Amino acid sequence: YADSFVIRGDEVRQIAPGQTGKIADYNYKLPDDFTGCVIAWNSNNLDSKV
């Protein structure tokens, strides 16, 4: 399973098992025993508009 989205720079830390915040409980939750991997990369060149 692959889940893709775009978030702010400071919220990447919230993506983790047993993590509490704003995204971590109101937008996307990961199970405590989650197995897999997470990939993040900057997109200020194309995903940011003047």
Partner: protein, 49 residues
């Protein structure tokens, strides 16, 4: 009828059983290295992980 302490064997058996039960019950009040000895305190203060 008069002299006591002649039945020490049965009395000491009873005392041993009572002491074992008492120490087993009292062991429930120990941290064992945790932060508290009552589960609800941990379940109320700390987060799951």
């Amino acid at each position: 009828s008069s002299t006591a302490s002649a039945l020490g064997k049965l009395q000491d058996v009873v005392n041993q059983n009572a002491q074992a039960l008492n120490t087993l019950v009292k062991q429930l009040s120990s941290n064992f290295g945790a932060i508290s000895s009552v589960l609800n305190d941990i379940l109320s203060r700390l987060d799951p992980p």
